[PDB]
């Protein structure tokens, strides 16, 4: 289930983080405009960029912490607040998070692992609800 | 589902509030001690008493508002705080609440009306967690 999936991802975090984020950026290539130096590169060229692996692992480290503190796929409001008030997220709206979770759920359903992809879908929708409550447009 | 159940209960709130509260007291008779004015009265005698119907509906009105504001049966931290810090709930521990929800779920499963009882069980478990957090021993 959801709680086990957190353990699975954490068990090979940088691999899952890069693969899921790549799924996101491939599904929604115009999302790369929020990042620097990601456009014009294949998957193997992003993976050999140092910043890409490091940053993307930090993103999923935090995502897993937010998932782990949730109850029944409902994140803490303090965690939503953090994600809204991060300088690095100042250009974002909740739609950017919706796209991320659509791609993440799609990746899980295509994978060879026994993920609880409906729970990740509930978590994404609940996180978008919480980001809205915390004042993200 | 759970939202429909809130609608069902609200539609005939005096009736459900009184029936569920009496199911609670009749399953856990020792709990009647907290309601000094209800000692020594049958189900049918309590209903003729103004503050019985009026305070029991207020109890269940608040329960429904907490239920309605919940996400995926997880109540708001602020609503848990309200229930802990009511003068009327000063002596209570979380076990009192756990007994109420055991009785409420039993009532739902016994009824002719079609309730999402495992969701109420979950809600109760999540409310007890939140109450503890908010300082109820
Ligand atoms: C729950 C979802 C998300 C979590 C937990 C999250 C977490 C993070 C963390 C921890 C950083 C800092 C990375 C570092 O400094 O190394 C970061 C930076 C950033 N995030 Fe997110 N993020 C999430 C969703 C998004 C989405 C959906 C977008 C855009 C589509 C986004 C855009 C950015 C940008 C532009 C930066 C700064 C640029 C960069 O690190 O290269 N975030 N986020
Ligand atoms: C989610 C669960 C509950 C909610 C929403 C709730 C709500 C309330 C509300 C709104 C009142 C004020 C009634 C009024 O004065 O009109 C009240 C009073 C009271 N409650 Fe609770 N209650 C809950 C659970 C419990 C439990 C589990 C106990 C004890 C086992 C308890 C014991 C009392 C007592 C002794 C009073 C004072 C009697 C009265 O005011 O009529 N309640 N409750």
From TrEMBL, chains A, B:
Chain sites annotated for binding heme b 9: 51, 89
Binding site residues for heme b 5: 88-89
GO MF assignments: heme binding; metal ion binding; oxygen binding; oxygen carrier activity; peroxidase activity
Amino-acid positions noted as binding heme b 2 in the UniProt annotation, renumbered to this chain: 89
InterPro entries: Globin, Globin-like_sf, Globin/Proto, Mb-like_M
Binding residues annotated for heme b 14, in chain numbering: 88-89
List of residues binding heme b 7: 36, 55, 89
Binding site for heme b 6: 89
Positions of heme b 15 binding: 89
Residues reported to bind heme b 13: 58, 89
Binding residues annotated for heme b 11, in chain numbering: 55, 88-89
Binding site for heme b 10: 55, 89
One Pfam family hit: Globin
Family to which this protein belongs: Belongs to the globin family.
Full protein name: Dehaloperoxidase A
């Amino acid at each position: 289930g959801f709680k086990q999936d957190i353990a699975t991802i954490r068990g090979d975090l940088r691999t899952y983080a890069q693969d899921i984020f790549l799924a996101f950026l491939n599904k929604y290539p115009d999302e790369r405009r929020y990042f620097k130096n990601y456009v014009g590169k294949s998957d193997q060229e992003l993976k050999s960029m140092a910043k890409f692996g490091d940053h993307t692992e930090k993103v999923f480290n935090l995502m897993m912490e937010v998932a782990d503190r949730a109850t029944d796929c409902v994140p803490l409001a303090s965690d939503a607040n953090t994600l809204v008030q991060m300088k690095q997220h100042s250009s974002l709206t909740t739609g950017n998070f919706e796209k991320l979770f659509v791609a993440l759920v799609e990746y899980m359903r295509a994978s060879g692992q026994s993920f609880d992809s409906q729970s990740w879908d509930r978590f994404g929708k609940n996180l978008v609800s919480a980001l809205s409550s915390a004042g993200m447009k």
